[PDB]
From a paper:
The structure of the regulatory domain of N. meningitidis OxyR represents the first determined for a wildtype OxyR protein in its reduced form. The N. meningitidis RD-OxyR structure was determined to a resolution of 2.4 Å by multiple wavelength anomalous dispersion method using a selenomethionine-substituted protein. As expected from the requirement for TCEP during crystallization, the protein was in the reduced form with no disulphide between C199 and C208. The asymmetric unit contained a dimer arranged in the classical head-to-tail orientation, typical for regulatory domain structures of LysR transcription factors which was first observed in the structure of the regulatory domain of E. coli CysB. Each OxyR chain comprises two sub-domains, RD-I (residues 90-162 and 270-306) and RD-II (residues 163-269) which contains the redox centre (C199 and C208). The two redox sensitive cysteines (measured from the γS of C199 and C208, chain A) are separated by 18.4 Å and are located either end of helix α3 (C199-S207). Chain B is missing 20 residues in total (residues 88-89, 209-221 and 307) largely from RD-II. By contrast, the side-chains of C208 are pointing in different directions in the two structures, with C208 buried in neisserial OxyR with an ASA of 5 Å2 compared to 109 Å2 for the surface exposed C208 in E. coli OxyR. The overlay with reduced OxyR shows that the helices, α3 and α4 which are located either side of C208 would contribute to the dimer-dimer interface in this model of OxyR. Therefore, the formation of the C199-C208 disulphide bridge which involves a disruption of the α3 helix would be expected to alter the dimer-dimer interface and hence the quaternary structure of the OxyR tetramer.
In N. meningitidis, expression of catalase, which is responsible for detoxifying hydrogen peroxide, is controlled by OxyR, a redox responsive LysR-type regulator. OxyR responds directly to intracellular hydrogen peroxide through the reversible formation of a disulphide bond between C199 and C208 in the regulatory domain of the protein. OxyR, widely known as a mediator of hydrogen peroxide-induced gene expression, is a redox-sensitive LysR-type transcription factor. Increased cellular hydrogen peroxide levels result in the oxidation of a pair of conserved cysteine residues present in the regulatory domain of OxyR which leads in turn to the activation of transcription.
Residue numbers in the entry:
A (entry chain B): 90 to 208, 221 to 305
B (entry chain A): 90 to 305
The structure:
């Protein structure tokens, strides 16, 4: 088979891919990947031009001539520096975060909106990588997507769940209505679905 | 506010930060960090305007009124899909990867040139149709996953190599003298906080990062 071109948003790509490759070898053993990571907007534009075959992005997503399929829901968690007061709380986070310094990802990341919608000087990182290590060092607190949280990273900060129903995002596969590789696409949505990504609720 | 503003290149930040954060809690346990990851040239401009207190970059680096202090050398390794011929090879990779499809980082990554300048059978392809025809990924993240998917082979910095990703591709050593990069600390020459600086170099030197040789 010949290369599928897949684009994933920044806040998803580094976490989904490792598992997508493994389950892709089950579902499309002979199909190489050509991979793009980028902002939703530049990703939509590139898919519209057929520069890229399918992209993984998140609600809200609506675009003429483009089809999306649900993949999974991914809950958010609050992270805080070691010794932050929320360390005493079980899963006590609603919008008690109005009184805290919160790092939000830069504009262009759909993750700024989805946390903002849950609850100039606004402390802000360009990425999860810089945001998690800023928090680790005590600069402030943030909100991360479940799949961005290493089992092994309670050494760096503390993950404090939201209470009740956590804010979450819906990750989806977007592709052109007129796309003409039905087998590659279908093989792709199955690798993702059989991927075994931790921390999410697959949509079935 | 006690906050030290530190910038690091893309191909360094994700691998050094976690350890650095841990060393830093011994050597400046009250110094919070503002961080930026970016391309070298972007980073230098920020250092110069004082938006950032210091930056982590690699050789070659020379800039007027900027000082650098070496931190470590970091070898490169070839990575190849599962089942690639290089897999039964010894540590055989000289530059006989002029014969292979070689993924390389996009323009703005100093790692593009370091990989190039090592080999030359590879600069040839760039001389050809290069710099857009070239087979490239903007990040080590997309590259590692194209190599693992089947797409091609590549050359990676040691500290990017998960001791537990033999699942995805195969790490092939360069024979004899591995090509390497030199990671260094750069700051303006008359920075007012020599103590902040010195705790940074200290925390990095003691970070215990794997696969590098520290420069003492
Ligand atoms: Cl990120
Ligand atoms: Cl540069």
């Amino acid at each position: 088979e010949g290369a599928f071109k897949l684009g994933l948003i920044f806040t998803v790509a580094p976490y989904l891919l490792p598992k997508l490759i493994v389950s892709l070898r089950r579902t499309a053993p002979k199909m190489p990947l050509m991979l793009e990571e980028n902002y939703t907007h530049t990703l939509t534009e590139s898919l519209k031009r057929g520069d890229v075959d399918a992209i993984i992005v998140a609600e809200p997503f609506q675009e003429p001539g483009i089809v999306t399929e649900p993949l999974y829901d991914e809950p958010f968690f609050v992270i805080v520096p070691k010794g932050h007061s929320f360390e005493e709380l079980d899963a006590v986070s609603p919008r008690m975060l109005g009184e805290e310094q919160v790092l939000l990802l830069t504009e262009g990341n759909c993750m700024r909106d989805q946390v903002l919608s849950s609850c100039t000087n606004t402390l802000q990182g360009s990425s999860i990588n810089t945001i998690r290590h800023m928090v680790a060092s005590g600069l402030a607190i943030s909100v991360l997507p479940a799949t961005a949280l290493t089992e092994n990273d309670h050494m760096l900060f503390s993950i404090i769940p939201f209470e009740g129903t956590p804010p979450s995002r819906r990750v989806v596969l977007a592709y052109r209505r007129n796309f003409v590789r039905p087998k590659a696409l279908s093989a792709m949505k199955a690798a993702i679905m059989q991927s075994q990504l931790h921390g999410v609720s697959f949509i079935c």
